[PDB]
Every structure is written in structure tokens, then in C-alpha cells.
Design a binder for this molecule. Structure first.
Ligand SMILES: COc1ccc(C)cc1NC(=O)CN
Ligand SMILES: COc1ccc(C)cc1NC(=O)CN
Length: 435
């Protein structure tokens, strides 16, 4: 695996021990061979689980998620996928790692796709080796892979709204259920319905995942209601998954705005990872997977692959060369390579809008490429009437940094800035000049 110009897909089935058994063996061999190695975790939660898997091995944990005192001598780094891509974009020296290991390498967030494109390009150049660890590589067509224990798979109508009758199987269950919903707002409705029926519910989404995931260990629960973020190595002591088989797809319309289309079917990879939360214990056969729809390749034309091109166009590789997406996921976007390359100062603005600004990549790019500086929020108010953001059926309003009350009406409308109460609160703070 560890030889230059090799990219290995470690595609053992979910729960086969890729992280707890195989990874430490790879790391030991890498240190022996004096390979400068990076290990990429999808989330802080997985970063902390990896520290447990790798304990006593000399690894530099480049995250506050791990409380360890480093020796200073480590040649293995561990960081999150997004941290890798972030450091590549910034004017910070990132070592040219001899061995690049990506755990949960199916993750479809723009920074993960970009990281795979950069890494696979270095491997193609003959510069490096890589290992992509996932049960579900890009373009997998298998929603029902092998498991540690037999799974009961049932196609059934799954509620996506509060219900009064017709779904007794949902609440009659005495075990623990992980329920994949397509959005935070949809999870809120299902969660309230379950709570009203006497169930103990924990809700997980990207912004809340580290804090709320700990509740799955510290409190008794009946249901976890989660978005797709629990596809990325989240482990539960559960005996049932309920899968809507639905997701939201961010779509760029007429190069001009981003909508959250759907809900629509998940990919086969997503479905397999959702199901893969259960069947993990060879001593507990007959975990249940209840699924409410079919799969489709909804990653085609999904904004995250164009956003990944925006990131890669702005990462130095060698002279004017630009890293390609990882070949198996490269046709998910129609882009001209280099079309999003920004000059140094617009690039710094683009980076700051994504990090400090917490804006979606697409929206950060529209603002930075327009020659707007990071602190200039006039664009949050001067859009068309149809760009008016609504909050409880009234136009959303903020006090501008000038002290003027204005309707939020961004020049570029990205539905991700107002997809739920938390998102809109963050965007209101941004529009007001508060970060
Ligand atoms: C929302 O945060 C980001 C936005 C954009 C990029 C490329 C990375 C990050 N996150 C990190 O760098 C976390 N350490
Ligand atoms: C020669 O190109 C390839 C052939 C096959 C595979 C798996 C990857 C690449 N290259 C890339 O994916 C560059 N990002």
C-alpha cells in the first residue's frame, strides 16, 4: 500500500475494523519506513476515537478535540478533512506528506471532495501514496453491503411529518432507533411527534454534532434523529435504523442562486452508510433497517462538487497546475478547470468568508470574485426583491453595522444561509457586521 504512486481503496464492509484494527497497522509500518504521514478524520468525534485506536503510537493531533502532550518528534499528523483543505488554501506550509490516509473517505462535503482531488493528483504525479478508507467508494451501486451480523431489511412507508395513526411499528419498538431525516427542520417535526408520544429523542446535525453526540453516551434515549452527518463514522449502540432514504440537494440555478432541492433520494453509498449504523455486533443478529424510498445518483449536479472545484482552483500544486477531482467523482460537475482561480487578495477574501464568515463556499466565491472585501456587508441588503429572506412568514430584518434596520435581501441568494433557525441566526449576525 505504502509505495509511491499507489492509491489504495480500503473498502472493507462497514464495521469490518478499518479504523480500530487496520489503521494502527498502517501507521506502525509508516513510522518504521519514515513516511511523513497524514491521517484525515471527517469529524472531531472521529479524531477523538482515532486517538483511542492509535494510543501509544507517536501521532501529532492537530485538533483541540484530543487532549494530549506531543513529544515534538511525531512524523504522523492527524487532522480533520476540512482542516487539511483549509491549511492548503491558506499561506501556511503544509508538508508534502508521503502517505495520505483519509478515513470515512466517502464524505461529500466540499472540503473532503477537494482533499481527495488534491491527494489523488499528487499520487497520479508520482509524488505520494494514499489510502482511502470507506465501505462505499464513489459510484458504488450497492445499498446493502455485508455487515458484522445479519440485518432485517424492510421497505416501508416512513413518516416525514408528525403522525397520529398508521405507523404503530415506529413507536411499538422497545430498543434504540437511529432515524435519518433529510433536513434539520424535518427532524424537528418528527422529534416533537416522538417526544409527545413519550420517547426520549436526541437530534444531530452538522453544527450540533460534537455537543449532542455525547448525549448518546451520557443519557438514556429511544431515538436519535439525525441528518446525513451520521453517515461519517458516527457509532450508536442501536438495534434499528429508520431511513427516509431522502436528502436535500444544493443546486446552483442559472449560475445565479443556490436552492435546496428535494427532498430527493439518497445515493446508494449514503443508503449503505445509513444502514451500516446497525448490524455491527456479531452477537446481536437481527438489527432492523426500515427504508422509505429508493436510491438515485443525486450527487450528479450537486453543488458540493462545483464548490470542491472552487476550492481546488485556489490551492497551489505546482506552478499554474490545478489538481483534478478524484477520477470516480470527477463527472459529478461540469466546470472549466481553473475557472474559479482568484488573485491573491480575492483568494484571501474567499478564505476568510468561508472560515470566519462561515459562508457556504459558493456564496463566499460570489462575494470574493465581485471584489468585495470581507467586512463590506452592503451586498447583504441590495439584492432583488425575490432574494428577500423570510423568518416566520415576515421578511427577516437586522440592524446594520451603521445602526439602520434593514430587510435581509442578499445580492446572491444561497438557501443554506437560512435552511433552519440556527443558519438564519448566523447569517443575520454576519449581515450585521458581528463577525
Ligand atoms: C467552516 O469551516 C471551513 C470552511 C472552509 C474550509 C476549506 C475549511 C473549514 N474548516 C476548517 O478548517 C476546520 N479546521
Ligand atoms: C490517471 O488518473 C487516475 C486514474 C485512476 C484513478 C483512480 C485516479 C486517477 N487520478 C485522479 O483521480 C487525479 N485526481
Amino acid at each position: 500500500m505504502l509505495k509511491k504512486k499507489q492509491l489504495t481503496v480500503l473498502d472493507l464492509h462497514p464495521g469490518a475494523g478499518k479504523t480500530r484494527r487496520v489503521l494502527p497497522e498502517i501507521v506502525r509500518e509508516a513510522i518504521k519506513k519514515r513516511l511523513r504521514t497524514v491521517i484525515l478524520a471527517p469529524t472531531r468525534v472521529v479524531a477523538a476515537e482515532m486517538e483511542e485506536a492509535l494510543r501509544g503510537l507517536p501521532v501529532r493531533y492537530m485538533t483541540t478535540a484530543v487532549n494530549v502532550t506531543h513529544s515534538g518528534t511525531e512524523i504522523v499528523d492527524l487532522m480533520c478533512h476540512a482542516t487539511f483543505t483549509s491549511r492548503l488554501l491558506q499561506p501556511i506550509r503544509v508538508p508534502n506528506y508521503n502517505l495520505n490516509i483519509m478515513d470515512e473517505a466517502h464524505f461529500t462535503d466540499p472540503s473532503s471532495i477537494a482533499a481527495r482531488g488534491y491527494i489523488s493528483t499528487r499520487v497520479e504525479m508520482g509524488e505520494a501514496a494514499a489510502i482511502f478508507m470507506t465501505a462505499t467508494p464513489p459510484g458504488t451501486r450497492d445499498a446493502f453491503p455485508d455487515s458484522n451480523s445479519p440485518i432485517m431489511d424492510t421497505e416501508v412507508e416512513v413518516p416525514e411529518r408528525a403522525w397520529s395513526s398508521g405507523f404503530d411499528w415506529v413507536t411499538d419498538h422497545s430498543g434504540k432507533t437511529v432515524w435519518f431525516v433529510p433536513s434539520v427542520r424535518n427532524g424537528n417535526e418528527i422529534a416533537a411527534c416522538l417526544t409527545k408520544a413519550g420517547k426520549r429523542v436526541i437530534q444531530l446535525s452538522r453544527k450540533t454534532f460534537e455537543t449532542e453526540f455525547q448525549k448518546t453516551k451520557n443519557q438514556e434515549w429511544d431515538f436519535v434523529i439525525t441528518t446525513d452527518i451520521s453517515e461519517m463514522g458516527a457509532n450508536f449502540k442501536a438495534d434499528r435504523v429508520i431511513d427516509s432514504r431522502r436528502c436535500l440537494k444544493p443546486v446552483i440555478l442559472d449560475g445565479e442562486r443556490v436552492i435546496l432541492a428535494g427532498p430527493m433520494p439518497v445515493t446508494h453509498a449514503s443508503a449503505a452508510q445509513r444502514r451500516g449504523r446497525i448490524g455491527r455486533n456479531p452477537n446481536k443478529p437481527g438489527d432492523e433497517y426500515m427504508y422509505g424510498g429508493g436510491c438515485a445518483e443525486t450527487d450528479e449536479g450537486h453543488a458540493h462538487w462545483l464548490e470542491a472545484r472552487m476550492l481546488l482552483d485556489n490551492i497551489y500544486l505546482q506552478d499554474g497546475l490545478i489538481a483534478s477531482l478524484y477520477r470516480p467523482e470527477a463527472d459529478k460537475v461540469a466546470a472549466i478547470e481553473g475557472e474559479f482561480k482568484l488573485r491573491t487578495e480575492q483568494r484571501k477574501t474567499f478564505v476568510e468568508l468561508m472560515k470566519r464568515g462561515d459562508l457556504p463556499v459558493w456564496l463566499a466565491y460570489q462575494v470574493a470574485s465581485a471584489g468585495i472585501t470581507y467586512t463590506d456587508r452592503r451586498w447583504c441588503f441590495d439584492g432583488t426583491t425575490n432574494n428577500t429572506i423570510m423568518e416566520d412568514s415576515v421578511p427577516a430584518e437586522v440592524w446594520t453595522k451603521y445602526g439602520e434596520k434593514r430587510v435581509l435581501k442578499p445580492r446572491w441568494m444561497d438557501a443554506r444561509v437560512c435552511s433552519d433557525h440556527a443558519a438564519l441566526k448566523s447569517f443575520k449576525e454576519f449581515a450585521a457586521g458581528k463577525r
